[PDB]
Amino acid sequence: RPPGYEDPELLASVTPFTVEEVEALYELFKKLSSSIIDDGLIHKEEFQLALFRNRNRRNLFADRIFDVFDVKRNGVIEFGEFVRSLGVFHPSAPVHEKVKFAFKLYDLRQTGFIEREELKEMVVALLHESELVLSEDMIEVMVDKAFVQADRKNDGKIDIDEWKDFVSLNPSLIKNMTLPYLKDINRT
């Protein structure tokens, strides 16, 4: 009848998941939040591991993932923060939540915008996802083309509205914003 307890029905009701899936996602939270300290919290030290271990997204954006999972900005991931953040990568999660998330992900230094050197590191990391590693000058052409397409109100930075326009023409930037195993989950 414990501390940190959250009725699964609660999460269930604000997310694509269901009670059983929520209940199931607790099992996995316990694993990740106990590796090193056992305080019902995922320390960033322990996010690394679980991502390095059962590989999900990517190593150099684990600080970026950890950062946007950390919704109530307080340095750790709690269970409901984790379930609500994972729920965004669900197949049926509204595309608004996906676009927004993906933007928070890319705003590398957390400043409310996406700046040209963050577009670049992004584009590099997506390209290397699809096994393409390109010349430094192939890259700043692409990054230049992308940046003036995106930066509609012409002022050196992409805001959440121009992003939304940009992504509507470039839907593969939010490709990874969905993980299709999350439709029915796999015991382990």
User: Which stretches of the chain bind Ca ion, using CB under 5 A?
Assistant: 33, 37, 39, 41, 70, 72, 74, 81, 107, 111
What residues contact 136, with CB distance under 8 A and at least 6 apart? none
Q: Which does residue 111 bind out of Mn ion, Ca ion, its own copies, none, counting CB within 5 to 8 angstroms by kind? A: Ca ion
The one among 30, 72, 128, 175 contacting its own copies by CB under 8 A: 175
Residues in region 15-34 near its own copies by CB under 8 A: none
Nearest-angstrom CA–CA distance, 77 and 67: 9
CB of 181 to Ca ion, least distance (A): 24
Nearest-angstrom CA–CA distance, 127 and 54: 22
AA letter at 1: R
The one among 38, 131, 136, 184 contacting its own copies by CB under 8 A: 131
DSSP β-bridge partners for residue 119:
none
Nearest-angstrom CA–CA distance, 103 and 114: 8
The one among 91, 141, 144, 165 contacting its own copies by CB under 8 A: 141
160 touches 103 (CB < 8 A): yes
**Among residues 135 and 156, whose Cβ is nearest to its own copies?**
135
What residues contact 181, with CB distance under 8 A and at least 6 apart? none
What residues contact 143, with CB distance under 8 A and at least 6 apart? 116, 119, 120, 123
Q: Which does residue 132 bind out of Ca ion, Mn ion, its own copies, none, counting CB within 5 to 8 angstroms by kind? A: its own copies
Query: Angle 169-151-123 (CA atoms, 0-180°, nearest 5)?
Result: 65
Q: Which does residue 53 bind out of Ca ion, its own copies, Mn ion, none, counting CB within 5 to 8 angstroms by kind? A: none
CB of 51 to its own copies, least distance (A): 23
CB of 134 to its own copies, least distance (A): 8
| Contact status: 136 vs its own copies (CB under 8 A) | no
Residues that bind its own copies (CB under 8 A): 130-132, 135, 138, 141-142, 145, 172, 175
